Design a binder for this molecule. Structure first.
Ligand SMILES: COc1cccc(-c2cccc(NC(=O)CCc3cccc4c3[B-](O)(O)OC4)c2)c1
Ligand SMILES: [Cl-]
Ligand SMILES: [Cl-]
Ligand SMILES: [Fe+3]
Ligand SMILES: [Fe+3]
Length: 426
C-alpha cells in the first residue's frame, strides 16, 4: 500500500490495529495501534454493563510500559472511565492527551462516578490529573515521532476526532461523532486531509435516525401524557451532554402550553424559565405530577435508579430513555418489558410504569456515516463501538457501496476484541 500523501519501492512496513474494548461491542473503548516501533492507545473506557475488573478492556494482552501515546476522544465513561486505573495502577509511562474541555469535565465527572471492587479512588483520580496533557483543536503535536491533531466530533462538548500520522501514513479515529447539527453543539467536521485508515464508530449500524422534529415532538407528547394522567416522568440522562438539549426542548414546550406551567421540571446533577435545579433526594418533594431529569442515563445506580424503584409500581408514572442502552444495564433490560424488576437491595417490584425509548444519543446514522466515508474514501475502514449484529450489517452495506467503484476499493474490517488487523505500507 502506497500512503495517500506519497520508483523502485523498498521494504514494506506493517501496521497493527487491535481493539481491547469496543471490538464488536459498545463499551470500554480501547484500541491499540502499532506501527514502526510506536505504540498508541485510543481511548481507555469502562463497560457500563459489566462490574469491577470485568468492565475493563483487555489490558493484559499488552505491555502498558510500551505505550508511547494515549489519546482520549471525549469525556464519556466508556472512553475515559478506566483512565485513573491505567495511569495509577499500571506500568504506563507514556503521554496522555485530551482536549481542554474534555479534561475539565473529566475531573468532576469521574469524581461523581466514584462517589455513586472499586477500580480506583478519588485520590488516584487527582494524582493522575497532571499526567494528562491538553491539546487545542486544529493544532499538531508530536510524541515519539507520532504527529497527531484533532477535529471537532460533535456528540458532546470537547469531543475530538484524532488524526494520527506516522511515517507519512495517516489514520483518523472518530471516537463518538455526530453529523447532525445540535441546538448547542456543532456537527462533526469532515477533514479535507485524506486518511489511509479510518477507525469509526458503528453504534447504530444501518439504522436511519428519525427526523429531529419528529423525535422532539414524540418526546414532548410522551412527557405531556405522563404528567397529564397524574404521573411522574423520569428522564435518565448521563450528567452532561444530552441533558441540556432535552431541557431546552421541554422548556420550549412548557412555555407554549400554559396548562403545564404548574407542573415542575427538576434537573438533578452535581437559563430556563420552567426548570428547577435539584441537589439530591433529600432536597426533593416527590409530589406528582412532575418531571425529573436525573443521572445516570442507564439507571445502573444513583438517583435515576432510586427514582425508578420508587415510581415503577404506579402505572400513571413513566420513564423515557433517551440514550443508547448497553447490554447489562437496567435501561436495556426493561426494553424487554419484564413483569418485575429487581431493586438494588434485591427486592422484586412489578414494572407498571410506561417505558418509552426516544433516541437522542447523538451518534451518526448510516447516511451520515456513508457520506463521511464517501468524502474521505480511505482504503481501509475499521468498525468499532457497535453491537455484533449492527456492526456486521454496517460492514456489508458499506462493502456493497464500493463493489462497482473502479476508482477505489475500500476494505471494511470488524475485528472482535483482541483480534488484530494488519496492513502493509510500502
Ligand atoms: C453512576 O454513574 C455510573 C455508574 C456506573 C456506570 C456508569 C457508566 C459507565 C460507562 C458509560 C456510561 N455512560 C456514558 O458515558 C454516557 C454516554 C453513553 C452511554 C451509553 C452508551 C454510549 C455512550 B457513548 O456516547 O459514549 O457511546 C456509547 C456510564 C456511570
Ligand atoms: Cl520513520
Ligand atoms: Cl495476532
Ligand atoms: Fe460518547
Ligand atoms: Fe461511546
Amino acid at each position: 500500500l502506497v500512503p495517500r500523501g506519497s520508483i523502485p519501492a523498498e521494504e514494506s512496513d506493517q501496521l497493527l490495529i487491535r481493539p481491547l474494548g469496543a471490538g464488536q461491542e459498545v463499551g470500554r473503548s480501547c484500541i491499540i495501534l502499532e506501527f514502526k516501533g510506536r505504540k498508541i492507545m485510543l481511548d481507555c473506557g469502562i463497560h457500563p454493563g459489566l462490574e469491577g475488573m470485568d468492565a475493563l478492556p483487555y489490558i493484559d494482552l499488552i505491555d502498558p510500559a510500551e505505550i508511547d501515546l494515549l489519546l482520549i476522544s471525549h469525556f464519556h465513561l466508556d472512553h475515559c472511565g478506566a483512565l485513573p486505573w491505567f495511569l495509577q495502577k499500571t506500568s504506563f509511562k507514556g503521554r496522555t492527551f485530551m482536549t481542554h474541555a474534555t479534561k475539565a469535565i473529566y475531573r468532576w465527572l469521574l469524581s461523581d462516578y466514584v462517589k455513586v471492587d472499586m477500580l480506583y479512588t478519588e485520590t488516584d483520580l487527582e494524582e493522575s490529573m497532571d499526567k494528562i496533557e491538553t491539546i487545542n483543536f486544529h493544532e499538531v503535536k508530536e510524541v515519539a515521532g507520532i504527529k497527531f491533531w484533532c477535529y471537532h466530533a460533535g456528540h458532546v462538548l470537547g469531543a475530538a476526532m484524532f488524526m494520527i500520522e506516522i511515517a507519512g501514513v495517516k489514520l483518523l479515529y472518530t471516537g463518538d461523532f455526530s453529523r447532525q447539527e445540535d441546538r448547542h453543539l456543532m456537527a462533526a467536521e469532515i477533514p479535507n486531509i485524506k486518511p489511509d485508515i479510518l477507525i469509526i464508530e458503528s453504534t447504530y449500524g444501518t439504522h436511519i435516525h428519525e427526523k429531529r422534529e419528529e423525535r422532539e415532538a414524540r418526546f414532548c407528547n410522551t412527557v405531556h401524557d405522563i404528567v397529564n394522567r397524574g404521573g411522574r416522568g423520569l428522564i435518565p440522562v448521563f450528567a452532561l451532554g444530552r441533558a441540556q438539549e432535552l431541557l431546552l426542548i421541554l422548556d420550549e414546550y412548557w412555555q407554549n402550553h400554559p396548562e403545564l406551567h404548574d407542573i415542575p421540571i427538576y434537573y438533578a446533577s452535581s437559563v430556563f424559565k420552567h426548570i428547577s435545579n435539584l441537589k439530591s433526594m433529600d432536597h426533593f418533594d416527590d409530589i406528582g405530577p412532575s418531571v425529573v431529569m436525573a443521572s445516570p442515563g442507564m439507571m445502573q445506580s444513583g438517583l435515576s435508579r432510586e427514582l425508578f424503584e420508587s415510581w415503577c409500581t404506579d402505572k400513571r408514572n413513566g420513564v423515557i430513555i433517551a440514550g443508547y442502552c448497553v447490554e447489562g444495564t437496567l435501561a436495556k433490560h426493561i426494553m424487554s418489558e419484564p413483569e418485575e424488576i429487581t431493586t438494588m437491595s434485591g427486592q422484586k417490584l412489578p414494572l407498571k410504569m410506561s417505558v418509552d425509548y426516544i433516541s437522542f444519543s447523538a451518534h451518526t446514522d448510516y447516511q451520515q456515516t456513508s457520506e463521511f466515508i464517501r468524502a474521505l474514501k480511505p482504503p481501509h475502514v475499521i468498525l468499532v463501538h457497535g453491537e455484533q449484529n449492527e456492526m456486521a450489517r454496517l460492514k456489508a452495506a458499506l462493502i456493497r457501496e464500493y463493489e462497482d467503484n473502479d476508482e477505489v476499493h475500500i476494505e471494511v474490517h470488524n475485528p472482535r476484541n483482541t483480534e488484530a488487523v494488519t496492513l502493509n505500507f510500502r
